[PDB]
Amino acid sequence: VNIGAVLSTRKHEQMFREAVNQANKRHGSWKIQLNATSVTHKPNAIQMALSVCEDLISSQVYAILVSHPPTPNDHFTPTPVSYTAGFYRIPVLGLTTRMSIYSDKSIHLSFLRTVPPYSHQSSVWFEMMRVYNWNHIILLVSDDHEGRAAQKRLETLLEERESKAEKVLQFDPGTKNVTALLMEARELEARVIILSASEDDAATVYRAAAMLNMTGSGYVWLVGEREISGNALRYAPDGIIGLQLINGKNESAHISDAVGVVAQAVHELLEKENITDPPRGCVGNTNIWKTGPLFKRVLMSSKYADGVTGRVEFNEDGDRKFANYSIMNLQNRKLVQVGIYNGTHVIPNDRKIIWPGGETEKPRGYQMSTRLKIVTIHQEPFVYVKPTMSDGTCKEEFTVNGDPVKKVICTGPNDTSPGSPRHTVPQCCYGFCIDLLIKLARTMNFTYEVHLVADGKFGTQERVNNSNKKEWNGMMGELLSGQADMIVAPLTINNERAQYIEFSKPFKYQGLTILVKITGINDPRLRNPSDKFIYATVKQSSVDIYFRRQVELSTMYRHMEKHNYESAAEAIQAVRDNKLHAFIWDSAVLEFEASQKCDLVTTGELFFRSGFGIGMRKDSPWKQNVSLSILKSHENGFMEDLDKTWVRYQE
């Protein structure tokens, strides 16, 4: 029942003596007979470790307490005591340090604390983010050692929220060239600055942002416990969200809470059976504590009914119990406060949140980024690739119908992939998708960046690798990341192709159609292929997913996967010159081929009638504008004009 302690300052020793003298048996009901002893920390790390190894484990101690700020290791962490007591499964109370790397159960077997580490701070930040729908955030963490674990936890929680952030990487510890990333963040979704570095590493970023006037509206600064103290309050903008946990700042209150937790743990241990003493660490003794895993379970895997904090639902890692927060605001270094976290959900206090932008309501955090990468993909019915007339200048033509043709400056290859590998000549593209892009550009103002992608494949998930992981490729892999979220292409939403992101309203329902030289699905010629029935369609398209879902065309899939070409210009030129037999694509291409060529039968035999929606990101504030534009185009007379100009175009 002997309990030890290791402090450095006399005030901590006096507080521990008072705590073990008075109000020591109040925790619980059993009359404890603990023998509390304290060891003064030595200025040298080796001498103190030797004193620990010769006193604590020799006196058969059960728990300790390390809360002195001036550690002899000059690193603000109890390194020697922990490295010496970890062998005997001793619960080293590391409440003096907040390093999330030391709180991990990987390198430290028995190492608990009563101070929220960087992981708990990141969890609280993530909980505060989902309240105001802060999905696309940026992380400006400059620290490396604990910053890596912080950003890993952040990205894992973002993936668990069915989303993905944009900036979760570090740049440099304590740098001054953050002007580029700040200017890039000036045109992003949210201005929520996530900084979880040390004092100087955060002060450098603060002064660098102050030199660039980065103190506008919408900048939600999330700081930790020891990030703004002494002089970092001036470099940081006035109005930062200063997190603070109960009994975290006051040393006496923290020591009292730790003593109460230790008393509750000892009482819970005495409640059950198997009350054994740790092996005495004398010379030649290399015994392991038998009740080590059980002690870890009763510490972190169980709950606490009483104690100093008087809360329940203790964390499963022994870092910090989820309780009420005391987050105080620092508007010009005053006593103002913001919404505190009450362990399960943030509850607003009497005075609402004050923001540095100037107002008190919800600031302009969730801002629509004007930089929208409009990736252009080569399509057969809509995109008409042709060399540009003038150098860097397109001539908008006008057909015999009532819809004008607007050519966009599509920067990309001038021809298909087999023709040229890749070009950077800004040719002219025009089509239904181009007209929709022009309508969206003239409706709402935004900086569009058009660029023609090289490949023309959709990039399904049938035989792709994607760094040996299940993700999308081609032009859809960048959509989930957040770079090119607006794709001007009629993506058929009929299967798990669109289970991650939601598309817009389907504007066409033509579906898919086969070509004849196989006149219908009921004919055995279409079901059972042959040597001449070639199915050289676009590789990794929706037809592949449709054939994977259907189980009656197993003999057809064998002559389908090994025939799909990567490009489509060679395929359409072959099927036009009487080389291919079956080509499953949209009805507009077959209609145009039948209009321009009379030798082709073009029976159609279309029976899919699937919808065609514009590919857009699910979590984005621009997916509603696309639906509104589609609805306006449908209710107006432009629908039949676009149809007669693009789909049913006769020459």
Binding site: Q510, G511, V516, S587, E591, A594, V601, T603, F608, R609
Partner: peptide, 25 residues
Amino acid sequence: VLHDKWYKVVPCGKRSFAVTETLQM
């Protein structure tokens, strides 16, 4: 299953959807 039982013979059951473009000429 009881509803989709007397639809065995279908001259233009699954061919009626081809109305957007030209048929076999």
